[PDB]
Write a protein that binds this ligand. Structure first.
Ligand SMILES: *CC(=O)c1cccc(NP(=O)(Oc2ccccc2)Oc2ccccc2)c1
Ligand SMILES: *CC(=O)c1cccc(NP(=O)(Oc2ccccc2)Oc2ccccc2)c1
Lengths: 306, 306
């Protein structure tokens, strides 16, 4: 029993984290095989905020202008190239700790673990979600860029996020590991702001199923809803539309608990319309939307506490 | 910016996790140097619930009745002893991945990371606190006992918790790494229940300071309180008494924000008496008490967003 915001064990990623320095700029990089991946921001100077031209900035650099430090070992850079908003530094040594890995570009509503790092040293691990507006609500201080986000599946690390920047609302923006930003953001000092965000409906429903699996049914009711009428309510509360595909995805949790998906939708509609009246669910007084259906199945028992 | 329930990076502990089997009972163990630590429950049989006599159960075992599996390598047990509610199995191989480590018995209100494991394989990492009633609100399924809790400080892992059992309210009980339970619990199938719990006042205050550091002052007021009058309110709301030592401990956060501790106490008193009125703090609609003052200082910037 119990339900926590749980991250993947971070060891396989810890062994990949390095420090990259170009001139006076230092940040984190990810060392896999003989390549180090890092934000291309590392070639920026103190003046290059407004409109840096990265191609122009990079042609002015040589391999030896890049310093890569892996623990107490300096790695020699033997090639460099830029791919979208990431730099790839070929080093003369393959990381002996490279895990089995993949690079994945995730959809909004998907969750992942973040290993926050400073100067190539991991500091903490936490779970977050790609928001519908393609920001993440992370916890990052200066020096954290190049920290990565990941999922682990049968010992294969799927990297999905590299941290670049903090927007004015305190939320975070970054790229996949091929350097393409999530969302409309660009790596330049221009007015950029998070777009209006929405609540991830399919994840709220998954977490209501987690609450039931764990033994709690207070918020359930005798009603059902059509998918159309639910989505009318959802739209009113700034929730994302629920698709038939989402309903399909919630199938296994529905079957484990015996609660039809559209019946849980009627539960959620009542919760939106009436609030919680001072009660909690899984120890929260708000509806939680940063657990996917897969996350619930992974963490919860396969046997419901009936 | 941002504030998350952050765990320590778990790699140094992952490399220590093994599987221990005695007869038909299997659970997790912790391999440090040439010793494996595990719950003494591993020598229990299917019938030994009510009142097992562990000394009697153990004298009936030999070294070879214990099977220790570390990845795909079997470790040979060459000695065994029991210390309180843990077993120590001397193996013929020192763990080459042993980190610098210590064993610590923590006070209630202290936090730590848990690496949940099954069959010696880590599954997830999360943060929790030793509650005042000496349970933890973990996330554990069958097979998780022997999973450990830990803090990391300058590459030294301080182990503080080994998981044993789940109580009827779904909260969790376990030992320090020398096998002494936290709380009054015993490892036998007898009616045992969590005692009434309280909210960890000094941690709530730390988290209010985190909210201010991150840029949010809505809940502040122009009032102060004496420590005595605050504790009268605290006692009324099932909060723990605040001591002058706690006030001292909150000194650095007070100094970083310019908010005297007793002024933050007046804030908290108002929040208890009036509720939040639909507002949130650091994205929570409840007052959070599983961040220590040390946790806040570690995660937050050293510069307040004024
Ligand atoms: C650390 C890192 O990798 C990084 C990546 C992108 C952007 C930034 N900092 P920022 O202030 O923008 C730049 C400044 C100078 C040179 C290039 C980019 O990020 C930012 C934040 C909010 C709005 C606009 C830009 C660091
Ligand atoms: C897995 C493990 O290490 C462990 C440690 C202590 C207790 C248990 N299970 P439990 O049902 O009690 C025992 C059963 C059989 C033999 C010995 C102990 O735990 C428990 C839970 C709630 C009330 C009382 C006991 C597993």
């Amino acid at each position: 029993s119990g339900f926590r915001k749980m991250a993947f064990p971070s060891g396989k990623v810890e062994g990949c984290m390095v420090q990259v320095t170009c001139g006076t700029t230092t940040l984190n990089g990810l060392w896999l095989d003989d390549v180090v991946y890092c934000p291309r921001h590392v070639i920026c100077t103190s003046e290059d905020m407004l409109n840096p031209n990265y191609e122009d900035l990079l042609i002015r650099k040589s391999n030896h202008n890049f310093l890569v430090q892996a623990g107490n070992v300096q790695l020699r850079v033997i090639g460099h190239s830029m791919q979208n908003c990431v730099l790839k530094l070929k080093v003369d040594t393959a990381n002996p700790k490279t895990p089995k890995y993949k690079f994945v570009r995730i959809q909004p509503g998907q969750t992942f673990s973040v290993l926050a790092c400073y100067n190539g040293s991991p500091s903490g691990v936490y779970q977050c979600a790609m928001r519908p507006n393609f920001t993440i609500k992370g916890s990052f201080l200066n020096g954290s860029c190049g920290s990565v986000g990941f999922n682990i599946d049968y010992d294969c690390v799927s990297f999905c996020y590299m941290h670049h920047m903090e927007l004015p609302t305190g939320v975070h923006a970054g790229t996949d590991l091929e350097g393409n930003f999530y969302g409309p953001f660009v790596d330049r000092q221009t007015a950029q702001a998070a777009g209006t965000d929405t609540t991830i409906t399919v994840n709220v429903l998954a977490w209501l199923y987690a609450a039931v699996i764990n033994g709690d049914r207070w918020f359930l009711n005798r009603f059902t809803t059509t998918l159309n009428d639910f989505n009318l309510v959802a739209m009113k509360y700034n929730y994302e539309p629920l698709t038939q595909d989402h309903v399909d995805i919630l199938g296994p949790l529905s079957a484990q608990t015996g609660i039809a998906v559209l019946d849980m939708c009627a539960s959620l509609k009542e919760l939106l319309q009436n609030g919680m009246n001072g009660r909690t669910i899984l120890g929260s007084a708000l509806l939680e939307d940063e657990f996917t259906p897969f996350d619930v199945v992974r963490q919860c028992s396969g046997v419901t506490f009936q």
